[PDB]
């Protein structure tokens, strides 16, 4: 039996969601990008409800809850794709019905972004990332998202501390063979931050070109 915060995050983990690319629409970059932005829009709803299960998140000001999500949302989306992809080779599981290989990434104009997501996948495969570690890192990525606009700095630090403590407690109990495993997990966050910045810049530019329709919530997070 391990850390209660980790157990709680596991039960809070949202259900799988399908991409459901429109089978009447011809394959194209615009279809692939529409499908991914539509999938992100739906996952963002699910991410908002998930964050409310994080101990202490709901006690922040709605302003601070918004700030954390506005900074971390794309990291949370990327970590989901990364976790789903760990048993695959050079493929990204956006959804069980939407697995992109290199050819498809090329066809969508996503080769560079997807190669960086695959770099995250490669590191977590080598580390044998567990679901417990995944859900704890997602919560840490949210709490540690470095928003410029935080009101209650000390409360956000306490949230970081609670989740960091849960990771350290989990690793101390489950991974006695590697007393630095928690730190190794924290050392994966810079690549997640870098890949997230690349993703947001890329989809912001697609927003500017105006050829890919996007729903309200995805647009709001891109514009933040």
């Amino acid at each position: 039996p391990y850390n209660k915060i980790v157990s709680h995050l596991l039960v809070a983990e949202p259900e799988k969601i399908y991409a459901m690319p429109d089978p009447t629409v011809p394959d194209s970059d615009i279809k692939a990008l529409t499908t991914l932005c539509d999938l992100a829009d739906r996952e963002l709803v699910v991410i908002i409800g998930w964050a409310k299960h994080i101990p202490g998140f709901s006690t922040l000001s709605l302003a601070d809850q918004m700030s954390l999500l506005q900074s971390a949302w794309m990291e949370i989306l990327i970590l989901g794709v990364v976790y789903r992809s760990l048993s695959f080779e050079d493929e990204l599981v956006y959804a069980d019905d939407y697995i992109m290989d290199e050819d498809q990434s090329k066809l969508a104009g996503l080769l560079d972004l997807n190669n960086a997501i695959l770099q995250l996948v490669k590191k977590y495969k080598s580390m044998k990332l567990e679901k417990e570690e995944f859900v704890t890192l997602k919560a840490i990525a949210l709490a540690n998202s470095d928003s410029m606009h935080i009101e209650d700095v000390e409360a956000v630090q306490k949230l970081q501390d609670v989740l960091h403590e849960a990771l350290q407690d989990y690793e101390a109990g489950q991974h006695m063979e590697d007393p630095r495993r928690a730190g190794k997990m924290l050392m994966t966050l810079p690549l997640l931050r870098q890949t997230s910045t690349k993703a947001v810049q890329h989809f912001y530019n697609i927003k500017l070109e105006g050829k890919v329709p996007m729903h309200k919530l995805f647009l709001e997070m891109l514009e933040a």
Binding site: K52, L62, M66, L69, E220
Partner: peptide, 12 residues
Amino acid sequence: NNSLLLHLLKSQ
């Protein structure tokens, strides 16, 4: 205060 994100965060 027109934000969908704020609306979903308030949503019970």
